[PDB]
Write a protein that binds this ligand. Structure first.
Ligand SMILES: Nc1ncnc2c1ncn2[C@@H]1O[C@H](COP(=O)(O)O)[C@@H](O)[C@H]1O
Length: 504
């Protein structure tokens, strides 16, 4: 059943499991793998014959998490075109930038549309076409007027995204059919996803975590995916959806797991479904959150490490049946090479820190139009992640942090990851984030911000005293900012430099 293109893999899945459920919209749609497959084929045929989509063309998509997004995403890559999913919340200015930068030739939206995206597309003279799924007797309806021997090549572009800009400049990342097929195989393999598995999407599908792990790897296993009725995560409908659609796992970022834990505290379900595992990725999972999750929902919590340039998955803790999962660790490399290198590019022995570097068929060939970033980031096939970590003697990776977020206090580098984990263990802390700030005496100093739990009162001195009991003195935040809100990216991450800037 494996293939080196995602479209080929999905064709194999549809032929083997045509009547298994593939894609549900809560309360509304329940598509099987054959039905979904054919909706995609017919939509791709319309893209080629009626919307003039040629191999190598880029098609932008901006949708909530909907059935139309799934169908059209897969129709675009099936037509040998590159999908560029974009955040529906962008301004017309941002849409204009991303549409121009990706070389999009077409903009797809729902029937309801998106006014800023359409404004940007009109200005750039990029065609706009809408997509609507009506009922189970009809093809998906495209607003363009009136596929079989399309051949998908592994090196065809399939997915185009941009990097976050947390520590560097936002760069364009082109990913191929081969990149996608490889990551879907890796993700399926390490979690042993099969056609009996089922999940609910609780992350945006325009970022690789929700897209590759939640959606595409499920489909690639003949498994089922459910989208929330309202096109985005809802803490109140989450467990009803997980129960009704027989979910066996889910994946989220730590901030979303925290929201789910808060909901369990204020409104526990009388019963929870028994899951195979719960997955965390994209930002550090504090050990205390791992333990709270395992206690609350009774399933093993497996942390993974991933990035856009690796088409999501790089490493993961394994299934209990294959090995332990370690709090504070992101587990072992899956289906790719990984090495810890010092600044002279020498491989490090276990328990020696250095830059995490990867090599494999899941890794982008290179940033778009950025020969200097490619010369700096790639060497003999190996990509430099910008993350500092080390392997323990079991070969499990422990992340220390992004190179440019480590706090250099008088020659000693502090890990904000480490301190975050400690902050979240304070009885009255709901959220917390440590960050580096300038310091006249030490060059850099560590500060942090915390959000107290509802109805609790916390002081800077409380937090500092608690930190002192649990960290070497040099790591203790010198200033503690109390606040009621920490901004998050759409990918569910708190950006350290933004918080720092806000409180300085
Ligand atoms: N499990 C994790 N723990 C800590 N950091 C992570 C984890 N997964 C991803 N990251 C970080 O997220 C970055 C990728 O972010 P992006 O590709 O911009 O969505 C990585 O290079 C790491 O710095």
């Amino acid at each position: 059943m494996d293939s080196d293109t995602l479209s080929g893999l999905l064709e194999n899945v549809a032929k083997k499991f045509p009547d298994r459920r593939a894609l549900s919209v809560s309360g509304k749609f329940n598509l099987t793998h054959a039905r979904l497959h054919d909706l995609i084929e017919r939509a791709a045929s319309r893209l080629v014959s009626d919307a003039g989509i040629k191999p190598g063309d880029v098609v932008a998509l901006t949708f909530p998490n909907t059935v139309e997004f799934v169908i059209m995403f897969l129709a675009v890559i099936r037509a040998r075109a590159t999908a560029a999913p974009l955040n529906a919340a962008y301004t017309a200015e941002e849409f204009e930038f991303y549409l121009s930068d990706s070389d999009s030739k077409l903009l797809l939206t729902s029937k309801e549309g998106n006014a800023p995206a359409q404004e940007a597309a009109s200005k750039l003279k990029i065609s706009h076409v809408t997509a609507t799924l009506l009922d189970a007797g009809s093809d998906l309806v495209l607003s363009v007027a009136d596929a079989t021997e399309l051949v998908n090549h592994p090196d065809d572009g399939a997915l185009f995204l941009h990097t976050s800009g947390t520590t560097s400049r936002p760069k364009g990342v082109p990913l191929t059919q081969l990149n996608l097929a490889s990551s879907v195989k890796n993700i399926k393999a390490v979690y042993k996803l099969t056609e009996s598995d089922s999940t609910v999407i609780v992350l945006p599908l325009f970022h690789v975590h929700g897209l590759l792990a939640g959606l595409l790897s499920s489909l690639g296993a003949g498994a089922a995916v459910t989208l929330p009725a309202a096109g985005r995560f809802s803490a109140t409908t989450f467990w009803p959806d997980m129960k009704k659609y027989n979910a066996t796992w889910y994946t989220a970022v730590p901030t979303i797991h925290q929201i789910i834990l808060d909901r369990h505290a204020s409104h526990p379900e009388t019963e929870y479904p028994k899951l195979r595992f719960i997955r965390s990725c994209s930002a550090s999972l504090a050990p205390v959150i791992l333990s709270r999750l395992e206690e609350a929902f009774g399933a093993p919590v497996l942390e993974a490490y991933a990035m856009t340039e690796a088409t999501h998955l790089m490493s993961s803790n394994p299934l209990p049946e294959e090995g332990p999962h370690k709090p504070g660790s992101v587990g072992k490399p899956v289906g790719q090479e990984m090495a810890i290198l010092n600044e002279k590019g020498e491989i490090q022995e276990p328990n020696n820190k250095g830059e995490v570097c990867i090599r494999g068929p899941n890794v982008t060939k290179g940033y778009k139009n950025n020969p200097e970033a490619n010369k700096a980031g790639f060497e003999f096939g190996w990509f430099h992640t910008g993350d500092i970590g080390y392997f323990d003697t079991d070969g499990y990776l422990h992340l220390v942090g992004r190179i440019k977020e480590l706090i250099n206090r008088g020659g000693e580098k502090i890990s904000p990851i480490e301190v975050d984990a400690v902050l979240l263990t304070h009885p009255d802390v709901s959220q917390g984030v440590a960050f580096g700030v300038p310091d006249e005496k030490y060059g850099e100093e560590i500060n942090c911000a915390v959000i107290p739990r509802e109805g609790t009162t916390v002081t800077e001195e409380d937090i500092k005293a608690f930190c002192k009991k649990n960290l070497a003195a040099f790591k203790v935040p010198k200033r503690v900012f109390i606040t009621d809100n920490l901004p998050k990216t759409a990918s569910g991450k708190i950006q350290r430099r933004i918080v720092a800037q806000h409180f300085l």
